[PDB]
């Protein structure tokens, strides 16, 4: 078995920026990795294609995955609306970690964030399930459109996404 790799092509107000690919740790967090993989191919009939990064805070993270409400209040998993915290084996150790956003214990949906710094205060509260494999420079470029309060100055969208391996 190999860990899946999925990609996102990011656009900034419709202008293509570039591709970010992620390795998902299906060997450590199989259920959380599967959720993200299936939302990236859109195979259940809904997913990340066309959604936006609604909250970006420079030096901290880029948050997206709300494909229903596009504002932090929506999204759902492939398992129903929310699922449990699978485990907290992996930590928020540096730039590039992919982790689940939530609204408290066992409330995982579709929203996630990509860390641009070590965020150890989130350890044990947010399930880490992947990391940026290629395209960290596109994540850095994305950060420039964020602000201290999270609002973005340009619309950052997942123009396309899918599975590579």
């Amino acid at each position: 078995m190999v860990n899946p790799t999925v990609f996102f092509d990011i656009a900034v107000d419709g202008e293509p920026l570039g591709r970010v690919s992620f390795e998902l740790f299906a060997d450590k967090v199989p259920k959380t990795a599967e959720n993200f993989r299936a939302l990236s191919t859109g195979e259940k009939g809904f997913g990340y294609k066309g959604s936006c990064f609604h909250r970006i805070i420079p030096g901290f993270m880029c948050q997206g995955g709300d494909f229903t409400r596009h504002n932090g209040t929506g999204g759902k998993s492939i398992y129903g609306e929310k699922f449990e915290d699978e485990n907290f084996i992996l930590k928020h150790t540096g730039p590039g970690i992919l982790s689940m956003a939530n609204a408290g214990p066992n409330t995982n949906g579709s929203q996630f964030f990509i860390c641009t710094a070590k965020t150890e205060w989130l350890d044990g509260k947010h399930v880490v399930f992947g990391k940026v494999k290629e395209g960290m420079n596109i994540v850095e470029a994305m950060e420039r459109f964020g602000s201290r309060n999270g609002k973005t100055s340009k619309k950052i969208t997942i123009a396309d996404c899918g599975q590579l391996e």
């Binding site: 909250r55 805070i57 901290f60 993270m61 948050q63 709300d66 932090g72 209040t73 999204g75 982790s99 956003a101 939530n102 609204a103 408290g104 409330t107 949906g109 929203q111 964030f113 965020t119 205060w121 989130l122 947010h126 999270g150």
Partner: peptide
């Protein structure tokens, strides 16, 4: 503060 929540964003 610096959290990543879904619905009530805290400081």
């Amino acid at each position: 503060x610096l959290l990543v929540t879904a619905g009530l964003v805290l400081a």
